[PDB]
Design a protein around this ligand. Structure first.
Ligand SMILES: Cc1cc2nc3c(=O)[nH]c(=O)nc-3n(C[C@H](O)[C@H](O)[C@H](O)COP(=O)(O)OP(=O)(O)OC[C@H]3O[C@@H](n4cnc5c(N)ncnc54)[C@H](O)[C@@H]3O)c2cc1C
Ligand SMILES: Cc1cc(N)c2cc(F)ccc2n1
Length: 436
């Protein structure tokens, strides 16, 4: 199936890879691009797996994988957009092929060659590593035994959505471990499903409130109350000590003495970059942020770039970073595709992210957003803007229930001005003052 040589080889078939393939085809007409994906699915976007796909009025949404934004599919393109790998060398004006169900297990940088899990070898001229990451798991779950492990979900892929959606219709109690984006969005989604069926949803995490690492405490606490009003039993300040099976149910023991009985656990406790290929490829990994260490142009070696969740890159403006946003995979993937066709451009356009936690909670963010940084919040906590500061300069912004204003927030961070009155800057977001 796979040819012996391809001009453009993209390792991994996710958001960053697809954005790169589209970018290469737009900058190099007739280009021949091969995506190698270990998943059986064609490239698709993940955000709907924790949001729109759970709020669809169509009960066949699990099969169609379409959602209302305007209806559209979770796949970036239908199969008709792609050509087969076997035909990729011969088709006139080239195309984009995806070799599904295949994993790159060896990378030879000196010879511009990869080896697949089935023994196949492919040489390339330009290569992109866009392997993303794998969900982390709790140490308490790893030591819990096979039964507990079989009743614990790591949420990332289409299969995880389908398996958890089926569970929410079969069991009475689901527990989410994790207070970040994924845990909070799944809590609101499972909470909506539970209100109609009369079932239970629990979310526990060690922080004082949802999104405690991202939002200031006062806004994290406000968010926790909104999640609770979606039908979720939220347990902050919860550290899992052990997990076992008791009378057929899962028993979660917390360090503080509390105990939670439930039927199924969803672990949403972060992501580990997929850097397996750094060993054979002799590629540098970043010990501080994780991931493949690349420069401002997302380049690792002469013919190898890295994009997406797995790329630790140099931001000429904000310093060295690694970002795990959908839009960042798109932006970095497209940038890598342009540099794979001679652009030599540095990461410059700042990617944004967003989150929706029910009807009354939606926010957008950009730049360095971290609750450890000093923050200034200007609210009208219905609507407002939170500025994240470093050396008296705005390095990140969170827009709370403010939409269609991201270009303004992007300009403020790019300009790097020293603002003496952030209340005037809040007027740019139609806000007419909390500190942390
Ligand atoms: C449920 C969910 C909801 C999200 N919601 C949001 C949101 O609302 N807003 C937001 O900004 N971000 C969101 N994100 C984050 C966003 O989806 C990620 O930042 C984005 O998918 C990262 O793109 P990627 O290409 O770097 O990685 P991935 O999408 O993970 O793609 C990597 C692909 O490469 C495959 N692969 C790995 N190693 C190999 C190998 N050796 N050989 C072959 N294939 C390999 C992996 O199987 C995977 O298929 C969400 C993520 C999830 C999981
Ligand atoms: C930056 C970001 C934003 C989100 N809304 C998000 C949601 C998820 F479910 C998982 C990861 C996420 N990462």
């Amino acid at each position: 199936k796979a040819p012996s040589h391809v001009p453009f080889l993209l390792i991994g078939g996710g958001t960053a890879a697809f954005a790169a393939a589209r970018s290469i085809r737009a900058r190099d007409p007739g280009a021949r691009v091969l995506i190698v994906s270990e998943d059986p699915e064609l490239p698709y976007m993940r955000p709907p797996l924790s949001k729109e796909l759970w709020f669809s009025d169509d009960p066949n949404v699990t099969k169609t994988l379409r959602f209302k934004q305007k209806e559209r599919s979770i796949y970036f393109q239908p199969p008709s957009f792609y050509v087969s790998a076997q035909d990729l060398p011969h088709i006139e004006n080239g195309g984009v092929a995806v070799l599904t169900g295949k994993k790159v297990v060896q990378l030879d940088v000196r010879d511009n060659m990869v080896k697949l899990n089935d023994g196949s070898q492919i040489t390339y001229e330009k290569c992109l590593i866009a392997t993303g990451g794998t969900p982390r798991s709790l140490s308490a779950i790893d030591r819990a035994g096979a039964e507990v492990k079989s009743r614990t979900t790591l949420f990332r892929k289409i299969g995880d959505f389908r398996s958890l959606e089926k569970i929410s219709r079969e069991v009475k109690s689901i527990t989410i471990i994790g207070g970040g984006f994924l845990g909070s969005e799944l809590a609101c989604a499972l909470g909506r499903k539970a209100r109609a069926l009369g079932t239970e949803v629990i979310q526990l995490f060690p922080e004082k409130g949802n999104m405690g690492k991202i939002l200031p405490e006062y806004l994290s606490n406000w968010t926790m109350e909104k999640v609770r009003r979606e039908g979720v039993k939220v347990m902050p300040n919860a550290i899992v000590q052990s997990v076992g099976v008791s009378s057929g149910k899962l028993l979660i023991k917390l360090k503080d003495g509390r105990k939670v009985e439930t039927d199924h656990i969803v672990a949403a406790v972060g992501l580990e970059p997929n850097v397996e290929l750094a060993k054979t490829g002799g590629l540098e990994i970043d010990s501080d942020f994780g991931g493949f260490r690349v420069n401002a142009e997302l380049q690792a070696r002469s013919n190898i770039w890295v994009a997406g969740d797995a790329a630790c890159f140099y931001d000429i403006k904000l310093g060295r970073r690694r970002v795990e946003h959908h839009d960042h995979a798109v932006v970095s993937g497209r940038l890598a595709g342009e540099n794979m066709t001679g652009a030599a451009k540095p990461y410059w356009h700042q990617s944004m992210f967003w989150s929706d936690l029910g009807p009354d909670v939606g926010y957008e963010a950009i730049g360095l957003v971290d609750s450890s940084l000093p923050t200034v919040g200007v609210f009208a906590y219905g609507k407002g803007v939170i500025f994240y500061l470093r050396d008296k300069v705005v390095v990140g912004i969170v827009l709370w229930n403010i939409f269609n204003r991201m270009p303004i927030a992007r300009k403020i961070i790019k300009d790097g001005e020293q603002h003496e009155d952030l209340n005037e800057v809040a007027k740019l977001f139609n806000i007419h003052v909390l500190f942390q």
